Symmetry: C5
Subunit: 147 residues, 5 copies
């Protein structure tokens, strides 16, 4: 009946991860939507994890109506920051189009822990909740179009 | 009369209005018809056009072209580049992979001022520029019997 | 028989557009090649147009031997420059491979209009003729190889 | 049956290569997982090798449960850094999705030799192990989804 | 029957291209492998050329064991440097994966004509030879895997 989504969380920085999740679940809960939660090491494996979910469903496995990506990448002194940020979001967008699925992108790309918390906190900019909401929104348009 | 789909990313509500207004005028003056759909941010614009095509293949509404409306203003974070890059890159592939006409109206500005100068019909009117561009692309698709 | 090209020009800066177009027709003429010219608003729609041509060809429409993409992107005070430059040249390179076609890349991406005219003018760097000639060489290779 | 991983190392900086390889084999061994180590000249050939491996598996060859990519790019005076770092990482992420395979990403992308050692040492950041571990986690998730 | 490679060179800067090709041929003679040499105008038309080579082999043409890509891009004032460098290599990297072929990437991406010479010359950094040996090595890994 109600939409059932998969929340794929890249758990690199534990505390912030809990923040994004707190808001994510909140939004889904309010909307009366259910979900499952899978934890991955870094934002880089988020797109492959959703890929895994798709293949499973095509084997009689759980079928999800939408996904929500949660993660945080903080700018240090190494170029790695761009790469982890670019590849995760790049592969995530290609995925939403090529597989025609509803994806809410909640992967932060800030310069420091300061900025992260302002966006991570639910009582603040609650980006985790904004991502869950977007996913719900997309789940809606997907139906409205007959996709 | 061509019937397009305007997919607007409503992040900055006021600028969104500026662009939409801009785009709706270019099509009206063209006698073109359209439908408007709203997504939270520029990142879901491409998957939305993808949904449109899918719904069509299933007897759904058939669109002659699409107009993409959106705005990304650089903050203090690198998020600006990501949203900009990915929404535009994906949108480009799509036009090619599905052979569809798309008017790219996704602003990639540094500050709110640049955002207002391109989003205003009275100014650069990049909202209407994308509508016309899409109309033009629609015409080409036909002339090539694609 | 002589090759028949499709010149896909992005006409954003009319005056520079003519510079490139003049240098491209010049080269093509000088080598006995014939062509068709199509106009698009910005460099972003260049690939899609070659895509339309490719679909049309598969529907009895004209069959082209090669393509000559001509365009110009001048950096502003906005990141939009990077995007137009990036996506137009990324989609093209892609198209030449995915479809195995001959394409001359004549899309300028300069810092200012001063530099624009240097690469656009046939009396100068004549990038229109260089991109045009390129397509001819590729059309040739495409044959020597058997594809 | 413990997983069998394929360690694919780009050995450009011989010493750093050893540090990462050391950290990778450490994590896998603790996990009780077996593996094979194949060497390539640079991060650019890492993804194409994993490709070679999947092809062999489809031809009765060895079948790996997951992959571990190890490499290192230190920025110098050339833009080559950007390229080597970007392409190697991008193709490696597409592959994880297109092919739906577990891939730990241990390719270092740093500004200098200092940052390189901080990250390639098992005694320190231990990126080599973090990668192997990531590959292991993905292998479990893959099975959990029955993908 | 030794391995037959295809050297695809972008002859933009005639002298640097000579240096590069020289280092490449040498490394192949010494490894005792044969090869053909095809010439293109810019690094941008290298990936398409290899593509042409593959489709030809599917139409009964010469079947190559690997490919060596040679080219040099020097940073001017224009953003064109970024594009030529990025696209050539991106298209090259993906091609190798998508087609599972052995490719040696020898496209130099430098800041000035002096950096290029230290890399181009065989009596120096010998990138041209380095690239050839890569193609050989990959041709080797491609076999050991049964790809
Ligand atoms: O989600 C993140 N993952 C990170 N790890 C990179 C990658 O996501 C994987 O964990 C690992 O590289 C191998 O897959 C980060 N940094 O390294 O800085 C980061 O800031 N954020
Ligand atoms: O269109 C925009 N969307 C934005 N949101 C990001 C993305 O478009 C999605 O809304 C959401 O991230 C996941 O669905 C922006 N910022 O965050 O800054 C922005 O400037 N512009
Ligand atoms: O060819 C160009 N098109 C441009 N327009 C962008 C795009 O090519 C399309 O015309 C339109 O955006 C919607 O399709 C440019 N700028 O905006 O600066 C530019 O410099 N060059
Ligand atoms: O793995 C690396 N390979 C490198 N070589 C480039 C490429 O990986 C291949 O070795 C070769 O270019 C042809 O395939 C590097 N640099 O040049 O700096 C580097 O830092 N790291
Ligand atoms: O291989 C190169 N090609 C170049 N031309 C770009 C491209 O490779 C094609 O020659 C042409 O653009 C049309 O195909 C270069 N510059 O312009 O500077 C360069 O330095 N190196
Ligand atoms: Ca199912
Ligand atoms: Ca229909
Ligand atoms: Ca001002
Ligand atoms: Ca004009
Ligand atoms: Ca098997
Ligand atoms: Ca220090």
């Amino acid at each position: 009946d109600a939409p059932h989504l998969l929340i794929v969380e890249a758990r690199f920085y534990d505390d912030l991860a809990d923040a994004l999740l707190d808001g994510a679940k909140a939004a889904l809960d309010e909307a009366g939507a259910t979900y499952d939660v899978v934890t991955v090491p870094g934002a880089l494996e988020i797109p492959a994890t959703i890929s895994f979910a798709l293949d499973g469903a095509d084997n009689g496995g759980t079928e999800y109506d939408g996904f929500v990506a949660l993660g945080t990448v903080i700018r240090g002194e190494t170029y790695h920051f761009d790469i982890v940020s670019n590849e995760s979001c790049r592969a995530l967008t290609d995925l939403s189009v090529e597989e025609s699925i509803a994806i809410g992108n909640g992967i932060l790309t800030v310069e420091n822990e300061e900025q992260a918390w302002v966006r991570a906190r639910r009582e603040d900019k609650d980006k985790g909740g904004f991502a869950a909401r977007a996913a719900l929104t997309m789940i809606g348009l997907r139906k409205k179009f007959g996709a």
